[PDB]
Amino acid sequence: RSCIDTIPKSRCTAFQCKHSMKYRLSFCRKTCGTC
Ligand SMILES: [Li+]
Ligand SMILES: [Li+]
Ligand SMILES: [Li+]
């Protein structure tokens, strides 16, 4: 599986996924639902 978060997912906060492109696209692609 290629779809992963690159940081601990406890820090892949909904707060960040909603509005930070770096979270959506770099750090939290899985938890934010990009992949
Ligand atoms: Li936890
Ligand atoms: Li963070
Ligand atoms: Li924290």
Tell me, what amino acid is at 8?
A: P
Distance 34 CA to ligand 2 centre (A): 17
Ligand nearest to the CA of 9: 1
Instruction: Using DSSP, state whether 11 is helix, strand or coil.
Output: helix
The rounded distance, in Å, linking the Cα atoms of 35 and 14 is: 16
- CB-CB neighbours of 5 under 10 Å: 17
The rounded distance, in Å, linking the Cα atoms of 15 and 19 is: 7
The rounded distance, in Å, linking the Cα atoms of 1 and 23 is: 19
Q: In this structure, are residues 31 and 7 in contact, taking their beta carbons and an 8 Å threshold?
A: no
Residue range of the domain that includes 6: 1-35
Distance 10 CA to ligand 1 centre (A): 6
Q: How many domains does the chain have?
A: 1
Resolution (A): 0.9
Instruction: Using DSSP, state whether 10 is helix, strand or coil.
Output: helix
* Phi then psi dihedrals of residue 10, to 5 deg: -60, -25
> Residue 13, class by beta-carbon neighbours within 10 Å (0-12 exposed, 13-18 middle, 19+ buried)?
middle
Ligand nearest to the CA of 13: 2
CB within 8 A of 12, min separation 6: which ones?
A: 5, 23, 27, 28, 30, 31, 32
